Subunit: 310 residues, 4 copies
């Protein structure tokens, strides 16, 4: 596409996967499907019972002789759904005699019991799996901090709750042409976010600015304001944080195209102490303000520094 | 609050969230709620079942004249809750006929069956999730050790059962002022407790003093004894380890403020080995005993060594 | 063997183990064995009942007298499987009485009930455990990249969903000869695929070329194009990554024997770019087209470059 | 103790942990205890039913001339354990009267139902939790490898399964003495078994000799053969591996002592080729032989080599 990975976390005929994702449903949808399957099974078994009643429908409905046709289930009407409910739900009341010695399809009862236990097991499994928030800045910025040009992207958690001890990874994807003439459509170069020093794992208790220093080994070493607009480089940032309870790393992914990166601006502070509690403005959490950042190349700035040292 | 993370492990209208907290309950609380929901279901079902026979309940309670006004039940006005218990718990005794041929409403027993299965499934699921110790020094200290100024804090296991694969990470939170003049309220800079050499990952069999050397890279590089009181920088130290008995990872957080960071001290001995075993005293683990350590800063101590070189 | 680890992922009387793998069965096989075992348990219960009633199967069956050799149950000798189905499935219809005076032993019912509960409990857990792809290029290649010789192997995600957070680890197993004189049959030397730089934890949208630079530290540092056929060195590469949809860890072992690792070839581009249209074809993933890669030994080539520099 | 951690993996009043130990039982023990629990529940309820027989023992209990002393359950004798089995496991027949309209309390049925459901749920949960190989060389050896002194300890997996990512970590515990005169009784100093080079996650298809080179940073940098016995160094090695089929992490802990470390010893090849195919001999795993090595210290050896080369 134009943008490789979208800003939310997405990059840009099967009868088994539908069953797998059916367990991943809202509780109301799950209970609704759970009642519907049972109702269908009861209705089908009741229809089966009426088909077994074709043998004795009119011969001795109330004659009660020594042999009434071959009475099975002792029910005189098509409303034998009572017998079906009692057999499936294992609540046989005996008002309807389970069966006579007459050779009916007792195997129909064998099917109801196994099917019910199997349907019940499936429903229990579906109930078991079903019952058992990070934000990045809109515009990553470039600013001059502590004598070095740096690339800054802010990270936070919108909710008051924060998933502490997060880890950050940054990958710059852009096309590279090598010395031999090899063209790689999507070259991936990792960005230092403190991995060497162990600074990747950090606390986000407040919204904080993740900083990549531009240096000789950095992918941006020779990036300058002059050519940064044209270059199609794309930055993709993945954040993995283990939740406070039953912690598991959740991948919060964002992207920054050359348009989103801004030169000469830096994020505007989000923390201000009032009455011992630090006001956190999520409205200004993304907002960036102009700073006096040199427009020369980072390598050019280093060369100017060495010239000054002499 | 002025102190960011407290010493214990804490930093300083929803139907689903309360339901999630309810599954996380004591065993006694869980069995109590499990019996209470069933009792409510049985009582409600008894009342609703009583409503169906209201027309024939007084018409012929025991008269049964020529089997007329069939009640769709053989139950009497009082203690008809037995029919509710039989329907919900699937005992299905035939003393009271579940449903007479007279139709009335047979859908009441369908509702009871689905509700009972659903309530049973939810209770089983809540029961399934329910069934299925590190300590830090009160005061961190600084002393001269092995020719280098160092910062030490005790880390111990309260229970004799060991915690394997303990990893210790220390992050110092203080407000940095950049060269540009952009103020960072909560700048987090990592402290090297052995991450490079793999000394970070340690097996704690007894309380062991984790030590960070104050070198050029250390945030404390230029902290003299006079400076340590002045600065309000805070340490946050986290130990993540799994139990020896079971592979369950526990994360224990702790904090240290300038008030609890002492100078010219060293921890006392927790273990003295004699009589066939280590003599373990946790009385002295929190306690410290003073030492004579140069008041000059670590950078200043290296400067003093340079002066000795002259 | 000739090849240590095969190309797919494989390297080259117990009641508990077969039982453990039995839970890992196809859904159809599991439901089939479940219904079959339930039917078998029911068939056995019916047979034991005939033996229990064997003494009174005639004596009071023919007489139909009052409490005189009254049978254990009010059932006939033939079609007595109904009693077993009712007792085991907990239907308890009551046309046949559960136990009578002059019982002749009611112990069988206790055994049947415990066995039935145990069977259901055991086979619900099996149902629960049961209900609750990266391709490597066939031929690793050697190409001249960025002014240095490099060993590169293509990794492809067959699934349209992109694999995320993939870590690559490469180990060269060779018959190392020590200077001491010890001959190590299977000496494992790790290969640097970006571990220090952090490039191992790569993000693959499309099949990408994993590259190892042949430097002094590299195991194949002195390997030569003439000797590339001679050697018996084998490369084992393992990829552990998370799917975008799900965080599932997998292992994909591969082998690159002396013959499979070509010299002078570079991979075929998988991605087709059409005005922002990205197409990934796995038909061309394995193809390699030749380049005039320098055939001198990497160490020899570096030394020649050094001599040229002078 | 004399030895801190034993060679197998061990280092050297509660009503909650007993339940955990009971869930952690053999399958036979779990089914046995469950059947015993069911028998206890039924037997206790049956007595209680005989106690309910106190109010109406024989007034119309047998003869039944009138409804006087109409029984809660129509059971003539103390052997009313048929009623207990029927009520608790929900197979009520009705040959024995379920309830009457003259009872002294039918709360016992409610108690029986709740206890039975709770017992079944607990016994299903226990069954669910219940249903749902590394070895080291007996004595480590210090030998001359590739012209440099090294510490070698052989580790392998007995089962042929291809355990993956068998990361190995070595910690040397000794009573190190500081310049201050305060000696930590246990000082954990990390040993570089490949963590710096990324060689730690070794494969164990063939038993393989883990090698630690002795350099300036190595703990044994100054140790010598004749001086090895006097020292108190204790080496503890922990190996973590995963089985092929996404197996759970398995942690094996082993130890060594001063007299279990030997000089000029090389493990004999665990696998020796037979008939053109290498043969695995777990009998030869622990086997060692005396090899020709120099007896001087590693630091002293380095100084001697430097003197020879000036």
């Amino acid at each position: 596409i134009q943008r490789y990975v979208r800003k939310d976390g997405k990059c840009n005929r099967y009868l088994t996967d539908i069953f797998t994702t059916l367990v991943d449903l809202k509780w109301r949808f799950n209970l609704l499907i759970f009642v519907m399957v049972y109702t269908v099974t009861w209705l089908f078994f009741g229809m089966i019972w009426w088909l077994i009643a074709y043998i004795r429908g009119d011969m001795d409905h109330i004659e009660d002789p020594s042999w009434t046709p071959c009475v099975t289930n002792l029910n005189g009407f098509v409303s034998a759904f009572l017998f079906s409910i009692e057999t499936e739900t294992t609540i046989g009341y005996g008002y309807r005699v389970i069966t006579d010695k007459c050779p009916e399809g007792i195997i129909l009862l064998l099917i109801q019991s196994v099917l019910g236990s199997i349907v019940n097991a499936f429903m229990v499994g579906c109930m078991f799996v079903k019952i058992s928030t990070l934000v990045f800045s809109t515009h990553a910025v470039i600013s001059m901090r502590d004598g070095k040009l740096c690339l800054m992207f802010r990270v936070g958690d919108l909710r008051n709750s924060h998933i502490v001890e997060a880890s950050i990874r940054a990958k710059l994807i852009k096309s590279k042409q090598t010395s031999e003439g090899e063209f790689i459509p999507l070259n991936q170069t990792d960005i230092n976010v403190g991995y060497y020093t162990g600074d990747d794992r950090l606390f986000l208790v407040s919204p904080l600015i993740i900083s990549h220093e531009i240096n000789q080994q950095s992918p941006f070493w020779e990036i300058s304001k002059a050519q940064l607009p044209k270059e199609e480089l794309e930055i993709v940032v993945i954040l993995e944080g283990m939740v406070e309870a039953t912690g598991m790393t959740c991948q919060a992914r964002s992207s920054y195209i050359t348009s989103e990166i801004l030169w000469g601006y830096r994020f505007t502070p989000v923390l201000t102490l009032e009455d011992g509690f630090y006001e956190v403005d999520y409205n200004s959490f993304h907002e960036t303000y102009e700073t006096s950042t040199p427009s020369l190349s980072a390598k050019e700035l280093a060369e100017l520094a060495n010239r000054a040292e002499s």
